[PDB]
Design a binder for this molecule. Structure first.
Ligand SMILES: [Mg+2]
Ligand SMILES: [Mg+2]
Ligand SMILES: [Mg+2]
Ligand SMILES: [Mg+2]
Ligand SMILES: [Mg+2]
Ligand SMILES: [Mg+2]
Ligand SMILES: [Mg+2]
Ligand SMILES: [Mg+2]
Ligand SMILES: [Mg+2]
Ligand SMILES: [Mg+2]
Ligand SMILES: [Mg+2]
Ligand SMILES: [Mg+2]
Ligand SMILES: [Mg+2]
Ligand SMILES: [Mg+2]
Ligand SMILES: [Mg+2]
Ligand SMILES: [Mg+2]
Ligand SMILES: [Mg+2]
Ligand SMILES: [Mg+2]
Ligand SMILES: [Mg+2]
Ligand SMILES: [Mg+2]
Ligand SMILES: [Mg+2]
Ligand SMILES: [Mg+2]
Ligand SMILES: [Mg+2]
Ligand SMILES: [Mg+2]
Ligand SMILES: [Zn+2]
Lengths: 144, 140, 129, 102, 72, 55, 81, 141
RNA sequence: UUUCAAGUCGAUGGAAGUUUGAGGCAAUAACAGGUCUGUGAUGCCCUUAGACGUUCUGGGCCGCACGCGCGCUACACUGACGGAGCCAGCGAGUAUAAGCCUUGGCCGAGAGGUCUGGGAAAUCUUGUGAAACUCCGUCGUGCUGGGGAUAGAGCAUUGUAAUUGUUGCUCUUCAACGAGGAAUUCCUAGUAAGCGCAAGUCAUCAGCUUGCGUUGAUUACGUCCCUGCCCUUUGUACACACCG
């Protein structure tokens, strides 16, 4: 509840899940740099890890940093609701998952060929690079 | 009963009904003291009818108003009118008219809307545009 | 972050859909199958199956029974392209109307749970120039 | 089933006949010593319909704004049921309709 | 991009704050940011404590604006 | 057989579910106050119904 | 059945508009001017104004008798109503 | 003369009743308060994670004090706000039903409110007693 | 002031002193203006049983290298979020249906579900406790907590039927955009601008119209410089009238 000082404990650059995080960002919004971690998700893992949101990224100790990456990789074990997850009711094993920085584009990709392998209409328009959700195309999306 | 006069003030849609009774000087807005009106930056709009005449005028009378309709700002102007009109109307009926004409002089010389309701109302919208005078942008 | 490794493992993996592998998937009744797919499919079967989807399934079943040297089960044609693919009809071949022609599709296992007309585009793609 | 608190509801589009029937009933409820409550002017309802002027879709976008005012009045009477109904036949008017509810 | 304002308070800057803020006609969130090179959030906690420590007198209190002056 | 196909598609809750009193049209219907009249048919009958232009 | 006040006054007007055009098409040759619907207890008085009240009331009033029957059968009215 | 809820500013009265309700500790807090957002129109959960439920329950109690048989559906509309539809214009959307219903249900077992006849939730015989008390311990400074 | 005329500008009184504010109606003629896709309004031509009638099924009217117009979000700090404060008006609403407005209670993070009750209505939904707005906090000039396209996975609603996602909800991805060239539109007081709400379409869908109210200004109250139109004079070999 007052200004405090520290020396040598701040860490300017963090590395979490093979992603570089700026250490002078507030912890809740620093994790949003990790792809697959939005503002809504980052708010809860810090609250489940008892990391008060009033701390910058470099303020955290190693003990706290490992406690966060553990929760993100195992969300359901920490009373994180299934509906709150990124990839729930998975295609192959049917369980609720939350894919992260490097895993996200791999399983996002696997969904694309899975649409394209069966040659569905939605997968085809994805192949063409067009809008797949029915949006009009006669007058919008003319950039490159 | 007792010496009671009832009046009202109005703005665009807001209407504030003021009851002025004889008493110790109780002045409430919808059952709450005027010292706690929400629009703080406008709290002096309702303080004006008080400090203009002097709080000594309110020793013998208590005022309870009920303001409904309009908006947040439109309600403030409705309240201050009901109070100003209520103080004048009580003097005309239970005090000599010389004093009533004195109070009305200070009020009118400061702000006409303290006693006279503003007649401005919203102009109806006309087709061919999104507003009363505004029109859809034209192309050739 | 500690570390990470990705050594993917197998065991003669059979294709699997939401935790149910192909062997058990195909002989599950369609009443049980809909309980493990999306919200739209679950709603559709609760709303009541009219005679049209059920009639196509009966013909599709017979078309497979027509051939027992284990080749393709001959084509059943249909207009009803709001049909939801079920594991029962895997391997059958259906002709799905796109408004003009009978597009022919073979029901692969990964097609299960999808709409039958989603694999027959109704418009020839635009080609400028 | 004698003297009752009886409601007569008056609705019409035009006010001249509505006030004549309303006043005529009040007049007959005066010389007859029957206590009465009314008439009560209900807030008039403005039925508004806004169409396009063009039967086609050509020209400036001009609109008609039609209206149908409905005026409703209720009058409370303290009299036996036989007396109130015959009053209605005395003050019968084509435009105004009457409904009686106990 | 050129801002790079300091968000962590070390000891060299801390006593520099207590040595420089008293010699200001008017201090605010922007005044602290403009001249002390500290961040806005760090300025807000600094203002709320310097007032509690008596060095700074609150001229006006508001969420969006904090008007303060020297207490000497 | 044919009677089960002829005019078999549902024609409720749709634009084709209703029509003008006057012209039996499907487009530009006015359903307010249970008029069920075409917007063109309404204009040529508005005075008779009791709708007048005042403002 | 149970009809709202807004929807009842409109229905009376719509009934008038449809009834008025019916006379214009049927009694066009008799100079039809207009119709007045005088509601009354136990009866629905209808006054039609025409240049010639013989074509409507012809051959022992057969046409007007056969014309009021076309309205009872279309608006589900009692024959005496 | 006495003191009532209407004689104290609303904003700092709730901050005082919220403090009492947290320190008293008898109010039952549902287990999802650290996860949920107040409204479907909101995009983030409340910033005061430890205290937001207490303050909202304090707000609910004060709002019910000034009125008669307010329902739980009306509470969702009151605390609801403008939704940030992306490119479409803004619109008012009601708040979450469970959060308001749990508060009034939680407040019903702490003794401040009760189900009123002809719908709604009245303030309790003791509900008037203890709110007017907090007002007195608000204005002494 | 004025031809002391019609009037105009200031004050005072007044609720109102711009025709008191706003509209509805609106002349003599005319256009090859638009509609036979509003009509069981129509002349003529075409078709009339392998129909161009009508009906059923499915698709399309949304289709995408592009140009143009009406708009909605925004590019942030006069701000975003998070809590808290908490104010309108115009209106609409059903039955043996083919189902209306729906409070209140109970489930659900939500969307939504369920049980009762009220209202054919100044009675109930409804004080439609709307949003901008205000207070207190977090953020701190950073493509950032601005912006929320695009897309993956999942949950509900309507409907016979949602695939070419009807709509709504949850998590995630988080693009151009850092105030916009030549040009060009609307507008003078409760007006402009924001800001929402209701009614129409409507089983579902409002970034649309028609209205309504909340907050509420800057700047003229002048001119013919541009533009359009009217009048007078003029020329005319035009009068089907310069599309001569
Ligand atoms: Mg076809
Ligand atoms: Mg609100
Ligand atoms: Mg709010
Ligand atoms: Mg926004
Ligand atoms: Mg937006
Ligand atoms: Mg006028
Ligand atoms: Mg023409
Ligand atoms: Mg032409
Ligand atoms: Mg035709
Ligand atoms: Mg035709
Ligand atoms: Mg039509
Ligand atoms: Mg044919
Ligand atoms: Mg189109
Ligand atoms: Mg298409
Ligand atoms: Mg336009
Ligand atoms: Mg806010
Ligand atoms: Mg009401
Ligand atoms: Mg999005
Ligand atoms: Mg961003
Ligand atoms: Mg122009
Ligand atoms: Mg649609
Ligand atoms: Mg609508
Ligand atoms: Mg439209
Ligand atoms: Mg000449
Ligand atoms: Zn019609």
């Amino acid at each position: 509840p007052l200004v405090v000082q520290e020396q040598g404990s701040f860490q300017h650059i963090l590395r979490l899940l093979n992603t570089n995080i700026d250490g002078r960002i507030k912890i809740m919004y620093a994790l949003t740099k990790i792809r697959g971690v939005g503002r809504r998700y980052a708010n809860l893992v810090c609250k489940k890890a008892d990391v008060e949101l009033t701390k910058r990224a470099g303020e955290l100790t190693q003990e706290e940093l490992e406690r966060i990456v553990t929760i993100m990789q195992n969300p359901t074990n920490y009373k994180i609701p299934a509906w709150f997850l990124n990839r729930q009711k998975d295609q192959v094993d049917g369980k609720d998952y939350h894919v992260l920085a490097n895993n996200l584009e791999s399983k996002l990709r696997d969904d694309l060929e899975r649409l394209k392998k069966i040659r569905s209409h939605r997968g085809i328009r994805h192949f063409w690079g067009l809008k797949v959700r029915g949006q009009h195309t006669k007058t919008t999306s003319r950039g490159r | 009963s007792t010496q009671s006069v009832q009046t009202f003030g109005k703005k665009k849609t807001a209407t504030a009904v003021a009851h002025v009774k004889a008493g110790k000087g109780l002045i409430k807005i919808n059952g709450s003291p005027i010292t706690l009106v929400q629009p703080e930056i406008l709290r002096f709009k309702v303080y004006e009818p008080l400090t203009l005449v002097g709080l000594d005028k309110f020793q013998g009378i208590d005022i309870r108003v009920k303001v409904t309709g309009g908006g947040h700002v439109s309600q403030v102007y409705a309240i201050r009118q009901a109070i100003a009109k209520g103080l004048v109307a009580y003097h005309q009926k239970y005090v000599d008219e010389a004093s009533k004409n004195e109070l009305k002089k200070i009020f009118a010389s400061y702000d006409k809307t303290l006693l006279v309701a503003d007649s401005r109302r919203m102009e109806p919208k006309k087709f061919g545009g999104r507003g009363a005078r505004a029109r859809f942008q034209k192309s050739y | 972050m500690v570390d990470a490794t990705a050594p993917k493992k197998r065991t003669f993996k059979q294709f699997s859909f939401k935790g149910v592998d192909l062997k058990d998937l195909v002989e599950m009744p369609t009443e049980e199958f809909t309980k493990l797919c999306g919200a739209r499919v679950r709603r559709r079967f609760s709303r009541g199956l009219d005679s049209k989807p059920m009639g196509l399934i009966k013909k599709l079943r017979a078309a497979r029974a027509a051939t027992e040297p284990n080749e393709r089960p001959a084509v059943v044609k249909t207009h009803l392209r709001n049909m939801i693919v079920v594991p029962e009809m895997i391997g059958s071949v259906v002709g799905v109307y796109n408004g003009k022609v009978f597009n022919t599709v073979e029901i692969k296992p990964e097609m299960v749970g999808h709409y039958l007309g989603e694999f027959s585009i109704t418009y020839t793609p635009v080609r400028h120039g | 089933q004698q003297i009752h608190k009886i409601r007569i509801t008056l609705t019409s589009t035009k006010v001249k006949q509505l006030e004549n029937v309303s006043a005529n009933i009040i007049r007959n409820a005066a010389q007859y010593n029957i206590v009465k409550k009314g008439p009560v002017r209900m807030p008039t309802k403005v039925l508004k319909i806004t169409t396009r002027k063009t039967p086609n879709g050509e020209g400036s976008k001009t609109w008609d704004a039609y209206e149908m005012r409905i005026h409703k009045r209720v009058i409370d009477l303290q009299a036996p049921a036989s007396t109130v109904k015959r009053i209605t036949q005395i003050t019968i008017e084509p435009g105004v309709d009457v409904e009686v509810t106990i | 991009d050129k801002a790079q304002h300091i968000v962590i308070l070390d000891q060299e800057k801390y006593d520099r704050i207590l040595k420089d803020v008293p010699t200001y006609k008017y201090v605010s969130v922007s005044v602290l940011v403009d001249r002390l090179k500290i961040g806005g959030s760090l300025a807000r906690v600094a203002l709320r404590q310097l007032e509690e420590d008596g060095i700074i007198t609150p001229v006006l209190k508001h969420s969006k604006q904090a008007i303060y002056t020297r207490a000497q | 057989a044919h009677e089960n196909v002829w005019f078999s598609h549902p024609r409720n809750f749709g634009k084709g579910s209703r029509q003008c009193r006057h012209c039996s049209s499907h487009s530009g219907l006015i359903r307010k106050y249970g008029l069920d009249l075409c917007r063109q048919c309404f204009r040529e009958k508005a005075a008779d119904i009791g709708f007048n232009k005042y403002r | 059945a149970i009809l709202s006040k807004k929807k009842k006054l409109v229905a009376d007007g719509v009934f008038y508009a449809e009834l008025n055009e019916f006379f214009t098409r049927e009694l066009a040759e008799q100079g039809y001017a207009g119709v007045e619907v005088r509601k009354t207890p136990s009866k629905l008085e209808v006054i039609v104004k025409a240049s010639n009240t013989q074509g409507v009331l012809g051959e022992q009033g057969r046409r007007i008798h056969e014309l009021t029957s076309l309205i009872v059968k279309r608006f589900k009215l009692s024959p005496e109503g | 003369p006495g003191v009532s809820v209407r004689d104290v500013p609303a904003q700092d009265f709730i901050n005082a009743y919220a403090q009492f309700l947290q320190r008293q500790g008898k109010l039952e807090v549902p287990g999802y308060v650290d996860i949920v957002k107040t409204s479907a129109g909101n995009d983030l959960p409340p910033q005061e994670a430890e205290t937001w439920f207490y303050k909202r329950a304090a707000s609910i109690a004060r709002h019910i004090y000034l009125r008669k048989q307010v329902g739980v559906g009306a509470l969702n509309k009151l605390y609801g706000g403008a939704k940030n539809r992306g490119f479409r214009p803004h619109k008012h959307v009601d708040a979450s039903g469970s959060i308001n219903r749990k508060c009034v249900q939680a407040l019903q077992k702490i003794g401040v409110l009760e189900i009123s006849p002809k719908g709604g939730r009245r303030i309790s015989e003791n509900g008037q007693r203890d709110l007017d008390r907090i007002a007195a311990q608000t204005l002494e400074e």
